[model samples]
Target: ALGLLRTFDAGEFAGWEKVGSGGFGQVYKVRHVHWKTWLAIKCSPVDDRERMELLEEAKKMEMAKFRYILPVYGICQEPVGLVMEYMETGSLEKLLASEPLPWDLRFRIVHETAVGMNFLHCMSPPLLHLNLKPANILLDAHYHVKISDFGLAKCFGTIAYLPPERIREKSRLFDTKHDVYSFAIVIWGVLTQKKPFADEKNILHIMMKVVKGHRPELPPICRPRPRACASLIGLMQRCWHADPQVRPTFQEITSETEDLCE
Candidate 1:
């Protein structure tokens, strides 16, 4: 209900081309008939679970206060789809591998992510981004951060960003610290310009090491920028702590990261 008076008509958008697909659903670049503008639509089977997930995500987006979150525009109930703002640059993972972001842009992304996560955790029921990885983080045309596929993704996502407690105790990650742990892994990727355990033989190998409390090491590039590097590393270390309770809250991480911007 959340003040949304209209659900889009199924004929309102014409699917232009398929952009991407995953365990969740297929995404297409669509042209809105009246607005004469492009938007992204996620399509799934009529009975697919994603319909409910997308509805919930829509509600969450409506309730969300943070600007960094990608908001859902409307839904097509017949075909089971979600209409959302089109993100031009795509996912952070795609851009990072091809064109490495400068240190400043990287820090900005990290800060924006902290801001987004802070907003989610601050919600009334609090949303948990159980899957927090580069691919889940998107960028708009202006390179603004937009967190996508948060609580919406359930059974599928990368395991690398999962906290040790989730792996060891099969614990629920619907809280702030779990996301903080995942955020730390992502920040490590931002700083090192490398995926965590890129040297590892397999996903199982990486999971084993993570459960054993092994963490990513600082790269050579972090040495020269002592101030930002130290602050980032400190925050990451606390986030990835073996005990979830020991991890720094997103608010604390955001405040500490602000100092690095100086």
Candidate 2:
């Protein structure tokens, strides 16, 4: 009986197109839908496993606060799909696909995300944002970073954000330190306007580089913000530590960020 409310007639929705895609699913932008506003629909090829993930995530989103995460608009059961509030500013990934952002702004986003993620992780049933990347972080007009794509969420890191062995199964991400890794990559994009690693390297080699001491390049202006960014770069380095165990928790990161902002 509870499931009936989530099921909607697929054809009733209109004007959906593939705006973005990733390993999980394709994102479609919907206009003039029941919500009467822009919405993002994630369509997954129907399969038992895919449907289960959607169901589980729908439940999580329906329960979680909307301030730091995307709010689910219910599901399209027939097509095994789902919908949510569409982001106008797109993802932090596309935004940083070009030049580097100001050092202050970058720090602000990282800090805000950390605070939100910490709230999730600290819940009674902790949430592990398995896919913490720029592509999943969304921004509002004011530049607030909001986390989305909790489809692959689990209880803890296991290996989601840390090197294997650093954390056990279904664990916390050391309080958004994992997100910090992605933030560092975003910084690389802003500072250099380039991908951190060369494209020529194979995935395996690239990972080795990260393990063996190579990482994305940074510029002199990485921490150029004198006020809010006083220790921003330092925090970035800690977040991207090769040894995951060494990264600071998001709670700690959030306090520092507030200091800088104030």
Candidate 3:
């Protein structure tokens, strides 16, 4: 029995359109009857193990409520889906692919991400975002950041964003610092609007380079605020330090990034 979690009937939803799919499951954009709004639902095949996993993800989303964290409305019982707030603007990945962003907005995205991550890291047990990529970072109507898909066990196509330790270690004992490293790569994408190691076709080669202390090349300075760009580059380097212990905490990152927004 689900406690304190609202369960919606299958009949309540209409106009189901497949929007995306990933290691977790399929995502559909559906129209809610009562709510009278478009919502995104992530559903997996009806199996006991996957059902339990979806329920746990819903609970985590409900518990980790913050301004920049995506909000989950409820769950659908029949299909075992997690109903979440629909982000019309789509993911940061889509945005980067579409148009060029001003420096102010880019820094704001970085700052907001830091704030959201700080909130999760401040949680009692601390939620580690095992997957923190541009695609996982969604955008609202105003282009504000809303982090999604934390604490989920997903397959590994995000090696570029992962820290070197996670790649080398078989057990993969991740921590909050792991997210900081991923954030570095994500923000690097925000700044450059380019995929990390875009030229490297082989995933194993990318992993070898990362483990060997190679990082994405710093984006050339062409913006108005060179100082701000420099500051962010410095922060990014510090965040992705080889030693997890040396990485700056999200609390520190939040404060520094907030200042950069000015």
Candidate 4:
């Protein structure tokens, strides 16, 4: 079943440097010897469970082939990692932390993400991104958005971005709207550069607050164009509606966000 994925030999890569370590595994920046290009490989210990999970993630990446979605080149067999396109600017989370972004750039990031997400949801069997946050949204050298880390099981660290329904009902079927909810939070983070529930310490407390329909406070918007900012705020508010039925689809979000960019 996994034969479609290209396998890279150990000698094919060089200049390995650990870039990140998450719940799944460690990510490394490497250079493809033949292609002479940079790539990222996320590897975990070679165990049966880990190998299966990593391959499953690789398969989904293969299935979700799209422009705005991060491109997975292939996989490394020895260390059990997926060889993916290396984004020069790293993740949106890192960019946001480093410096402030102009309003136009921020709007573009949100729009591009919506476009990518819309593609995922429009797939034959829609891909539900159980995890969606700024950290998972990467940036290229030009600061364009590339949505990443979909199809993986839930990670506890993304609790703040999850929907209220997801927090309350553990067994409920996952829906595209759940991703919409997370996108709303991501929108807020991109616009305000503020981490959601930053003051909250306890994980359970954040979950309870989210279930009770609490949300991050809207920041003051007095800059570039207040009207556009307000429109975006309204869109995100609709996205994070306590009722999943009320949340707009990425198709709707894509159009609205595009308008704001103009």
Top candidate on lDDT is 3
Return the TM-score for candidate 1, rounded to 2 decimals.
0.90
Ranking by lDDT: 3, 4, 1, 2
Q: Whole-model Cα lDDT per candidate?
A: 0.78, 0.65, 0.86, 0.85
Give candidate 1 misplaced runs (Cα > 4 Å). 2-5, 48-50, 151-157, 171-173
Span of 10 residues, lowest total lDDT, candidate 4: 150-159
In each prediction, how many residue pairs overlap at the backbone (N, C-alpha, C within less than 3 A)? 0, 5, 0, 0
On a 0 to 100 scale, what is the lDDT of residue 243 in model 3?
85
Q: Which ten residues in a row have the lowest lDDT in candidate 2?
A: 156-165
Better of 1 and 4 by lDDT: 4
- For 1-262, candidate 2 gives per-residue lDDT tens digits of 1253256667757887788876666778877456677777888855688777777888777666658787787787656677777778878767777565776676677667777777776776776675776677888768887788887676521122344323333554443445556555554444454555545446656555566656655445433565444366566667677766687776776787677655
Please give, for residues 1-262, the per-residue lDDT of candidate 1 as tens digits.
4458247777887866888887766888889989998888777745556666778766766677468988778786656777788888898888788775777788888998889988888776777777778888999988889998755432124677877777887656456777888899898888876777777667776678888888877655354576787778778888899988888888898998777766
lDDT of 3 at 91: 90
Clashes of 3: 0
> What is candidate 1's CA lDDT for residue 100?
58
Candidate 3 vs candidate 4, lDDT winner: 3
Query: In candidate 4, residue 189 scores what lDDT?
Result: 94
TM-score of each candidate structure, all chains considered together: 0.90, 0.80, 0.95, 0.95
